[PDB]
Every structure is written in structure tokens, then in C-alpha cells.
Amino acid sequence: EDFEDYEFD
Amino acid sequence: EDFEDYEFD
Amino acid sequence: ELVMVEYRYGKAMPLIFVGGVPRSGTTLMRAMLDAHPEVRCGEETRIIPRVLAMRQAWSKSGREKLRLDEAGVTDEVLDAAMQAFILEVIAKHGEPARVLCNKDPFTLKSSVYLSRLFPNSKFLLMVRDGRASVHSMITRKVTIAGFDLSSYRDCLTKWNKAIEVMYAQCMEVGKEKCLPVYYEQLVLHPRRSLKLILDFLGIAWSDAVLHHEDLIGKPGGVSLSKIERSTDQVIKPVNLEALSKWTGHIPGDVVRDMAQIAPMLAQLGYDPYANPPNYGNPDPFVINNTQRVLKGD
Amino acid sequence: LVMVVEYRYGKAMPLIFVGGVPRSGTTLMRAMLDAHPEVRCGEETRIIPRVLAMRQAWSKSGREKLRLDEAGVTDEVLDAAMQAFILEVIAKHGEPARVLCNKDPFTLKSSVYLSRLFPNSKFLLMVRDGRASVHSMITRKVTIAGFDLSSYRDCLTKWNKAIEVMYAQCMEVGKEKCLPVYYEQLVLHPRRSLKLILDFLGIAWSDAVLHHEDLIGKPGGVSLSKIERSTDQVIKPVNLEALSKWTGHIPGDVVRDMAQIAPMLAQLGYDPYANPPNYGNPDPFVINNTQRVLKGDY
Ligand SMILES: Nc1ncnc2c1ncn2[C@@H]1O[C@H](COP(=O)(O)O)[C@@H](OP(=O)(O)O)[C@H]1O
Ligand SMILES: Nc1ncnc2c1ncn2[C@@H]1O[C@H](COP(=O)(O)O)[C@@H](OP(=O)(O)O)[C@H]1O
């Protein structure tokens, strides 16, 4: 996916 | 540390 | 202060930020708050933690900060920009309420910053046994950029670091403004827990917080996204099913090295060599809820 | 909303956005605008292009837009958050002025979106001969994400794609809202250029626009970052030295293939087979400025 379920640093 | 004069183009 | 009884959103607003490492009861917590008629949290915005990470990132990076400061884009300007972006998103992504709330797990890595930006905000830091949180993300494939789901060791190491930061931030914010909420205590003792939480928040009791599942899809109630990974758990009343499903699924080498991989376990009151800890005794209310869940209500 | 005289700012204010490919006279342009008493642009914010790229990516992904929509984070919410963020940065990062301006070169890749966020904003797209911009970035080592400074061929190819997009955006926004400004014509003819520019912007003529070098560091004047790459050029009056200096420094194979490498040159009126083109003849005003620079006044 272009973006995961979550992220931060 | 990917510092550049222009970082988004 | 801009339009949303006509509530105004502004930086001095009463706000609640809920967070924690994903798979720690954050959706349950926010849904229980949503059940209250004076509070709206709503769905994860996804974008708030991205702008925070962006903000937090180049303060260490010497070169970016120097360039920003020379451009007049100082802390004061950035902070003003961040406040405005965040308020717009929190205010406009759901229904208005007297007390607005945001739940995005990783925002709690920035509670010291958020507390400064929003001087009347409060924080609920969800704490769950890291073995339960890790087993959840691995078995359900809930993806976190930077966490390797093919490794219990990796996920536990990254859980540990994540909660170490969030807890340190919660302690710095202080007892008046940030409350650790333990997932297992929330589940075992919902009434006692919510009473303590609502007191901390300065918000009066409502039985509705103990019947969140009845307010799903309803006005002033609990709005759930069908794509969010916790939705099919949160449609059920508070129940005991997820407390210790992890037991027996941790690789032996990781079980051996548990206190060293995850020193935050013991620091938060979880015995790293109990498989599982005795989290406590369930209230009859949650025993009953669990029985209803099992029969298939 | 208010900047400390009492200036208001908001969504509907007539913002000026300056940009183009870097090394195209964008700092000169915004500096001449800063010299105007009613206008403030100030330094490159960096954070505006960054947040624009982030927001673009969020809607570009089908799945991510679906997730955001399901969260109540719709185009309308995102756009409101973007407007408020962008205005805070523009308003607060420099001195207050009646007319607010921003120069971050690659924001002009987003002029359609920006014009929608800010319905009274206008755009100045700096256009310079790509051979001059590319020679500039290579010889001075101005780093631009994805450009390989060891290759004129690569840098011209990427200049070409970048200006292609910005120029299409400019055309889409329309002649009322975006004006291409030719750097070589600004330099040769700054009086006439600024006359046309100020008129397009609906701002009254001021002579100070032709004297930006006297307003560096001054209140209501031109604020420069000491670490931006154009600063040591911009502290001088408009002068002729930089127009054609690229000529003879382009590798022979690239000169030969110029028309294939950078078809945007011909489209913009730069003859790709002239080394260099005749850009024109300078006003006495610029000849005199150039002479003062060579005498070492700056
Ligand atoms: N009604 C309920 N009762 C008990 N736990 C619940 C619940 N609804 C959600 N949870 C728990 O919250 C966890 C996810 O937390 P988060 O929302 O922060 O990702 C899930 O753990 P499991 O995946 O182990 O079941 C889930 O079961
Ligand atoms: N006072 C002035 N007169 C003429 N050109 C100027 C100028 N100040 C800056 N420029 C030109 O603007 C170019 C940089 O553009 P930008 O600000 O968009 O990066 C530089 O080109 P060179 O590097 O070829 O000298 C610079 O010489």
C-alpha cells in the first residue's frame, strides 16, 4: 500500500 | 538527512 | 475562534487526546468517550500524526532547522501553523460537541508538544501488555511503518521504544493533564475505570459510557469507520476475550529475553515472566458481557 | 485574523505566489516585489512545498482517500486545514504587509490547487532558458531532489518536465490568474516588466521596485536568508552578467540533442539550436547598474 495502517517516525 | 536546497518537486 | 448552542474551536479549547501504541484499546477508549453526549472523538484522522512527525523530525536535523529559522519560519510560526491545521481537522471531521477529542494512536508521542499548543487539552495514554499489543498486530496484520510483522522480537522492541517515549511524555505533561489508562483494568473494571477517567477529565458521569455498543451509528454517538482495523471488536460491549490470547504464541527465545527486549513491561507493572500476568478479577458486568458475546448477541 | 498598524489576513485575500524551476530569477522577482511598500514576500518557507506534497500524496492514493473519506477527513476538511496552515506560515514568517506574497519555486506545480484554496491569489511563473538554469544549478551545486548534478543531459530533461507541468498549470489557471515572466526580459527591461507585472497584480506602480538593493534588511524592505543560494546575487541591482554565461559550457552531445532533450525550450520561445539566442538589448538603466556592480559598489 502507499500508506500503512499507522506510522510516525 | 536528505537535506537539499529543494526537497519536493 | 471559528464556527463548528454554538461551540467555537480555538487553541484554548477543552480537548482530549487519546493514544498509545496501536492495538492497546485506543478505539475502545475513544468509543466509550464518544458514547458520552458532551464528547465527540470520531474516527482516526490519520493525517494529524503525519504532520506531528513532520514537525518533530527536523528539530534534531541541524540543517533543516537552521534554514527554517533563517527564513523566519521559527518555532512560533510553525506552532501557529500546526495549531491551525490540527484544529481544522479535529473540528470539521465530525459532529460538534462541547468537548472535542481526537484519537490517533501515535499523537501521544507528542503530548508535551500538544499540551503546549493546546493549554487546556488533556491526554489519555492507553497502556496494554506489549505481548498482547504485538500478538494482535502480527496475527491481524495491522501494519505500522517501521515494525517488522514477521518478528515478535522486532515488534516488541519497537513497542518498547514507542511506549517508553509516550510514557516519559505523559509523566512530563504531569498528573493533572495526562492519565495512563491500563487496557486490562479498563476491560476488567469498566465502571471504576470510567469513573476515574471522567473525573480526571472534569466531565460528569453518564451510564452511556458503559453501553457504547448501543450508540454506534447514532447521532451524538459512536461513529466507526468500516476500514479501521478495530471496528469489528468495538461493535461488541466491553468483554474479556482479548486479555491474554497472546499466551503461548511468543517464540521461546523471545519469552527468555522478554525483560531485556521490553523493560517497559516491568516499569508499567506487567511481570515480563508471567505468561500471562494475573491482570485481576473481572467485574460481573464484564463477565456478563463476555457471556452475551459468546452466545452471539 | 490579524498581524501586528493592523493588517487582516484570510482565505480570500489577494495572495501573490511566485515560483518556477529554481535558478530562474525567482528570488530576484520576489525581491523586487518586497521592495514595494504594500507587499511582503520574504524568504523561501520550505514547509509550504513539503505540506503540499504530503497532501497531494494522500489524495493520489485511492485507498488512502477512501480511508480519509470514511474518517470524515474529506477534500473539504483537508482543504480547510491546508488553507489555515499555509496562511499562518505566509502571514507570520515575515513582517506584516497589506499584500502578502510567497516564493517557494515548486509551489507553481500546484497552482491549480492553490488558486482553488485562495480564489483571489495570483501567480508569477518565472521562465528562464533551461540551459541557463541548468548551468546554474550544476556550477553552483544547488541541490534539487531527483536531479543528477553530474549530468547536463539529466538536469535539462528534468528542468523540461518540471516547467512543462508548471506551464500547463499556469495555462489552466488562466491569463487572469497566472502570468509567465521571462527572466531575460525582466533583466533587460525591468521597468517595462515590472509595469506589466504590477498591472497584472492590480497593484499601483512604485519606483522602489527598481531599487530593491537599497531595501535589503530594511523595515518594509527585502528580507534575505544568509544561507539561501541566490542571496549573493540578489543583493545587487538588476544586472546583465548572468543572461548568457552558460553558452559554451554545455557538453557537445547535449547541444546536439537539445531539441529532443528539452522540447519546452521551443514551446516557450527559446530557440534550442541557438547558442545562445539573442535575448535582446538592455535598457540604459540596467547597463548603468551592471557598470556599478563591476566598479564594486556592492
Ligand atoms: N468491546 C471490547 N472489549 C474488549 N476489548 C476490545 C473491545 N473493542 C476493542 N477491544 C480491543 O482493542 C484492541 C485494539 O486496540 P486499538 O483500537 O488501540 O488498536 C483489540 O485487541 P485484539 O486485536 O487483541 O483483539 C480489541 O479486541
Ligand atoms: N540582481 C540580479 N540581476 C540579475 N540576475 C539575478 C539578480 N539576482 C539574482 N539573479 C539571478 O537569479 C538566478 C537564481 O534564480 P533563483 O533565485 O530562482 O534560484 C541566478 O542566476 P545564476 O546562478 O545563473 O547567476 C541569479 O544570478
Side-chain angles (χ1 to χ4, degrees), chain C residues 119-140:
Chain C
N120 297 132
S121 60
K122 304 246 212 303
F123 302 76
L124 301 182
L125 171 53
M126 295 308 295
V127 175
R128 186 173 182 207
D129 191 320
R131 300 161 290 188
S133 301
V134 165
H135 177 66
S136 175
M137 70 183 69
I138 292 173
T139 57
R140 301 193 185 272

Side-chain angles (χ1 to χ4, degrees), chain A residues 3-9, chain C residues 44 46 50 53 109 143 145:
Chain A
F3 302 82
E4 308 300 339
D5 295 318
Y6 302 95
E7 63 198 86
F8 194 78
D9 49 3
Chain C
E44 296 175 337
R46 309 179 51 74
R50 293 177 192 144
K109 290 193 92 168
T143 52

Side-chain angles (χ1 to χ4, degrees), chain B residues 6, chain D residues 21-28 103 105 128 132 136 140 183 187 212 230 233-234 236-240 242 245:
Chain B
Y6 297 96
Chain D
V21 189
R23 319 311 305 166
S24 294
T26 63
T27 315
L28 178 57
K103 190 278 280 200
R128 190 178 183 194
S136 178
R140 299 188 183 270
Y183 164 77
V187 170
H212 71 89
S230 292
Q233 303 102 248
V234 139
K236 286 169 277 168
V238 181
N239 67 265
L240 298 161
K245 68 194 177 177

Side-chain angles (χ1 to χ4, degrees), chain A residues 6, chain C residues 19-29 44 103 105 126 128 132-133 135-137 139-140 142 183 187 212-213 228-243 245-246 293:
Chain A
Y6 302 95
Chain C
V21 185
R23 324 305 307 164
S24 304
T26 69
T27 310
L28 175 63
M29 183 71 258
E44 296 175 337
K103 193 280 277 196
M126 295 308 295
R128 186 173 182 207
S133 301
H135 177 66
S136 175
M137 70 183 69
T139 57
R140 301 193 185 272
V142 179
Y183 167 77
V187 165
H212 74 93
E213 81 282 5
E228 282 185 28
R229 304 299 316 269
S230 302
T231 286
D232 70 54
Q233 302 101 250
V234 179
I235 65 170
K236 302 184 217 162
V238 178
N239 64 264
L240 299 170
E241 280 204 271
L243 289 175
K245 289 181 306 197
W246 61 266
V293 162

Side-chain angles (χ1 to χ4, degrees), chain C residues 80-81 84-85 88, chain D residues 9 79-89 118:
Chain C
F85 184 103
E88 292 297 323
Chain D
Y9 69 94
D79 293 349
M82 292 297 282
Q83 285 169 323
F85 186 98
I86 292 166
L87 282 165
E88 288 306 308
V89 177
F118 301 111

